[PDB]
Design a protein around this ligand. Structure first.
Ligand SMILES: C=C(C)CCOP(=O)(O)OP(=O)(O)O
Ligand SMILES: C=C(C)CCOP(=O)(O)OP(=O)(O)O
Ligand SMILES: C=C(C)CCOP(=O)(O)OP(=O)(O)O
Ligand SMILES: C=C(C)CCOP(=O)(O)OP(=O)(O)O
Ligand SMILES: [Mg+2]
Ligand SMILES: [Mg+2]
Ligand SMILES: [Mg+2]
Ligand SMILES: [Mg+2]
Ligand SMILES: [Mg+2]
Ligand SMILES: [Mg+2]
Lengths: 328, 334
C-alpha cells in the first residue's frame, strides 16, 4: 500500500498524504470519542458498524475539500468531517433495516446481530449526536445539515415509492449526492476557502455523490462480497431497480424475457438472485450504466478544474477516478 | 375513533384564560401544518398521515401552559418550541409503531400498516430534519436542548428493548426507562415554554422538573390504557405490550403476586404473545390483578409529586391549568 495512498486514493505526494491521513484520523478520533460517551446500553450497537470498517470516503472528501482553504487543519474541519460521517453511519443503520441486509462491511449487519429495533434506535441516536456536534459549527452549518438530511431522506423515500431513468437520477442525487455536496460545502467553509471555492466544492460533492451511487449500483452486480463487504444482488433481491438494471430491462435479447420475469418484483430465492446477476453482468445495459458513470466523472472533472493548482485539486481528481473505478 | 385534544378534555379555568390557551395551541398546529406541507410531494402523504388522523396534542398544550408562567406567553418563539416538541413526538411515533409492530395509531392504520416499515422509518427520519430546521430558529441553546432530549428519549427506547443485566429492581428499571423515553420530551416542553416566554431561571428549571414527573405519570397511564382501554378509547389496539413482550408497571406488580392466576399470567407473558385469545386472556388477568392496584398507587404517587412540583410555580392561571393537566394525565382513558 503506497505511502501516497489515503483511504484507497493515491494523493500523489507522501507529505500531503500524511497531512490528509492525519486529518482523516482526527475525524475518526472525534467520532470514536462521541460514540464512547453514550450510555452503556447504546455503546455496543453504536460501535458495531463503526469498528467493522468503512472507506471513510466522506471524511476524506471533507479533508480534501478543506485542503483548498488556508486552514485545512482547523478544528472545525474535523467537526464537519465527523458530522458528515455520523449522518452517513446513521443512514447505514436505517438502510440495512430497509434493505433487509444481513452483511455490512464484511460482518453481520447491525440488524442481523442486534435486531431491527436496536438498529433503528442506533441510527436515531447517531442523528441526535450529529445534531449536537454540528451545533458547534454555528447556525449556517446547522441549516445546511438539516436541509441535507431532508434531501437524503427524500431520495430514500423516492426510491421506495418507486422503472424510470429520470426518477433514478433524482433518487441518487438526493440520497447520495446531497451528503457529499454538504461535505464539500463544510470543508470549504471551515478551512476558510473563498465563497466561490465553497460553492464549487458543494457542486463537485453533489456530482461525486451521484457518481458514487452509480458505482455502488454497479458494485451490487459486478463485485463479490469479499470486495464489497455486502451481498451482491441485494438490489435484485429487494426489487430496487438501479441504472444498470433499468438499462438491462430496456434491452431485447434471447434472455431478456427471463430477466424481465426475474426482476418483476423482489426475489427471495438466492439461486434466482444469482441467475439475475449472471444475466445483468452480461447485459449491454451494464456498459450503458458505466458510460453514464463516466459522464458524471467528466462533470466532476469539469467542476474541479477551476479550483486552484494546489495539491488538493490533484487529490480531488484522483478521488473522482477512485469513485468510479473502486470495487467496494 | 381516537381521543380528542387535551385542550377539549380539561377545565382550563376562566373563559379569558381558555381563549388565550386554545389560541396558543392552535398557533402550534398552524405552524406544524405549514411545515409538514413544505416537504417534497414524495413525503407529503406519509408526513400528514398521523398528524391529520388525530392525536391529543398533549405536548403543545404542556409547552403553551409552561409559557403562561412567563411574561411573554404568546411570543412567536413559544409557538416554534411547541411545534418542535410535537414534531419530535410525531417522529418517535413513526419509529415506535415500526418497533412495536402496531397496526393502528390515532384511530387510523399506522404508517407502517398503510405503507410498510420502510416508508414509516423514512417519514420518522424526515420529521427529525424538520424539527432540527425549526428549532434552529430559537438559537444554539434550544438546538442543544432538542439534540440532548432526542438522545435521551432514544436511550430510553433502547433501554426498554435491550433490557439489562445490571443489579436493578424491575420497577426501578421501569421507572428509569419511562423517565427517559417519555419524561425527557415533556421536560423539554416545560423548559422551552419557560425559556421563550421569559420565565425566571428557577421557573424554567421547575417547569423542566414538572414535565419529567408528568411524563412518568403519562407513561404509567399509557401502560394502564394498554391493558384497560378499548381501541375506540385509545385510538390503538389494546394488548400491544403483551404482544411485544414489554413488561410495564401493571405487569411487573401482577407477576409478584402468588397463586394460580399469577402462574397463568406468567406462562402467557413468558415471551411475546401472537395468539389473539391469549392476549385477551392476559389482559383479563392483568385487569383483575392486585398488581394493577399497585401500578395505580404508583401513578397516584407521581400525580402527587407533580402537584408538589407545580405548587412551587407562581399563583397564576397557568399553574391552575397545569394542575388540571396533571389530573388529566392520570384520569384519562386514551
Ligand atoms: C450511500 C451508500 C452507497 C452507502 C454505502 O456507503 P459507502 O460505500 O461509502 O460505505 P462504507 O465505505 O462507509 O462502508
Ligand atoms: C445509505 C444510503 C444513503 C443508501 C445507499 O443505497 P444502497 O442501499 O444501495 O447502499 P448499500 O446498502 O448498497 O450500501
Ligand atoms: C409517549 C407515548 C406514550 C406515545 C404516545 O403519546 P400520546 O398518547 O401523547 O399520543 P398522541 O395523542 O400524540 O397520538
Ligand atoms: C413514542 C414513544 C416514546 C413510546 C412510548 O411507549 P409506547 O410504545 O407504549 O407508546 P404507544 O405505542 O403505546 O403510544
Ligand atoms: Mg442498502
Ligand atoms: Mg437502500
Ligand atoms: Mg447498493
Ligand atoms: Mg408503541
Ligand atoms: Mg414502544
Ligand atoms: Mg403504550
Amino acid at each position: 500500500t503506497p505511502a501516497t495512498v489515503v483511504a484507497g486514493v493515491d494523493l500523489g505526494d507522501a507529505v500531503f498524504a500524511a497531512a490528509v491521513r492525519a486529518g482523516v484520523a482526527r475525524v475518526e478520533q472525534l467520532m470514536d470519542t462521541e460514540l464512547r460517551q453514550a450510555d452503556e446500553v447504546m455503546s455496543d450497537s453504536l460501535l458495531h458498524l463503526f469498528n467493522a470498517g468503512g472507506k471513510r470516503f466522506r471524511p476524506l472528501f471533507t479533508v480534501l475539500s478543506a485542503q483548498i482553504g488556508p486552514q485545512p487543519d482547523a478544528a472545525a474541519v474535523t467537526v464537519a468531517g465527523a458530522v458528515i460521517e455520523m449522518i452517513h453511519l446513521a443512514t447505514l443503520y436505517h438502510d440495512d433495516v430497509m434493505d433487509e441486509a444481513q452483511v455490512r462491511r464484511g460482518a453481520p449487519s447491525a440488524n442481523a446481530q442486534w435486531g431491527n429495533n436496536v438498529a433503528i434506535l442506533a441510527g436515531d441516536y447517531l442523528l441526535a449526536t450529529a445534531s449536537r456536534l454540528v451545533a458547534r459549527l454555528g447556525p449556517e452549518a446547522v441549516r445546511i445539515i438539516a436541509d441535507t438530511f431532508a434531501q437524503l431522506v427524500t431520495g430514500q423515500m423516492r426510491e421506495t415509492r418507486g422503472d424510470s431513468i429520470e426518477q433514478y437520477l433524482k433518487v441518487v442525487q438526493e440520497k447520495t449526492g446531497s451528503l457529499i455536496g454538504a461535505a464539500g460545502r463544510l470543508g470549504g467553509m471551515f478551512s476558510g476557502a473563498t465563497d466561490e471555492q465553497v460553492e464549487r466544492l458543494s457542486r463537485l460533492g453533489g456530482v461525486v455523490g451521484t457518481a458514487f451511487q452509480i458505482a455502488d449500483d454497479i458494485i451490487d452486480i459486478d463485485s463479490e462480497s469479499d470486495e464489497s463487504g455486502k451481498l451482491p444482488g441485494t438490489d435484485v433481491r429487494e426489487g430496487v431497480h438501479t441504472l444498470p438494471m433499468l438499462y438491462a430491462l430496456r434491452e431485447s435479447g434471447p434472455d431478456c424475457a427471463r430477466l424481465r420475469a426475474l426482476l418483476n418484483g423482489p426475489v427471495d430465492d438466492d439461486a434466482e438472485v444469482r441467475e439475475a446477476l449472471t444475466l445483468l453482468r452480461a447485459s449491454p445495459g451494464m456498459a450503458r450504466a458505466k458510460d453514464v458513470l463516466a459522464q458524471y466523472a467528466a462533470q466532476a472533472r469539469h467542476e474541479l478544474a477551476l479550483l486552484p493548482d494546489v495539491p488538493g485539486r490533484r487529490a480531488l481528481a484522483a478521488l473522482v477516478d477512485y469513485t468510479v473505478s473502486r470495487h467496494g
